[PDB]
């Protein structure tokens, strides 16, 4: 009550056609290689922790998301139902 509530987790997709691994600031390290149709992308999933950075943000993944962002994919952008 007043916190103590699970605000879930988030996996924010980073598109990288290099299948390299992203190790930033010893907070986030992982390469989850997924099929984006014809694009290969990694994604960072976090237990909704706080995003630590130092001088200049080293993440820019979950701090762009942290709830519901659309990077290197664009789910629906305008009209999330898509009028069909």
Curated annotation (Swiss-Prot):
Impact noted for substituting residue 68 to V: Inhibits motility and flagellar filament assembly, reduced binding of FliW
UniProt record, GO biological process: mRNA catabolic process; negative regulation of translational initiation; regulation of bacterial-type flagellum assembly; regulation of carbohydrate metabolic process
Mutation effect (residue 56 to K): In sow-15; suppresses the motility loss and flagellar assembly defect of an fliW deletion. Binds FliW
Effect of residue 35 to G: In sow-20; suppresses the motility loss and flagellar assembly defect of an fliW deletion
UniProt keyword terms in alphabetical order: Cytoplasm, Repressor, RNA-binding, Translation regulation
Main localization category: cytoplasm
Record annotation: effect of changing residue 65 to D: Inhibits motility and flagellar filament assembly, greatly reduced binding of FliW. Binds 5'-UTR of hag mRNA, is not completed by FliW
Subcellular localization(s) per the UniProt record: Cytoplasm
Entry's induction text: Part of the SigD-controlled yvyF-csrA operon and the SigA-controlled fliW-csrA operon. Expressed from the SigA operon at low levels during log phase, with a 5-fold increase as the culture transitions to stationary phase, peaking 1 hour later.
Subunit description: Homodimer. The beta-strands of each monomer intercalate to form a hydrophobic core while the alpha-helices form wings that extend away from the core. Two molecules of FliW interact with 1 homodimer. mRNA and FliW bind to different sites on CsrA.
Role, per record: A translational regulator that binds mRNA to regulate translation initiation and/or mRNA stability. Usually binds in the 5'-UTR at or near the Shine-Dalgarno sequence preventing ribosome-binding, thus repressing translation. Represses expression of flagellin (hag) in a post-transcriptional fashion. Specifically binds to 2 sites in the 5'-UTR of hag mRNA in a cooperative fashion; the second site overlaps the Shine-Dalgarno sequence and prevents 30S ribosomal subunit binding. Mutation of either binding site abolishes CsrA regulation of hag expression.
Family to which the UniProt record says this protein belongs: Belongs to the CsrA/RsmA family.
Protein name: Translational regulator CsrA
Organism: Bacillus subtilis (strain 168)
């Amino acid at each position: 009550h007043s916190s103590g509530h699970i605000e879930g987790r988030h996996m924010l997709v980073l598109s990288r056609k290099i299948n390299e691994a992203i190790q930033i600031g010893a907070d986030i390290e992982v390469k989850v290689i997924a099929v984006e149709g014809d694009q290969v992308k990694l994604g960072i999933d976090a237990p909704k922790h706080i995003d630590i950075h130092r001088k200049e943000i080293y993440l820019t993944i979950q701090e762009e998301n942290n709830r519901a962002a659309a990077l290197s994919s664009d789910v629906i952008s305008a009209l999330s139902s898509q009028k069909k």
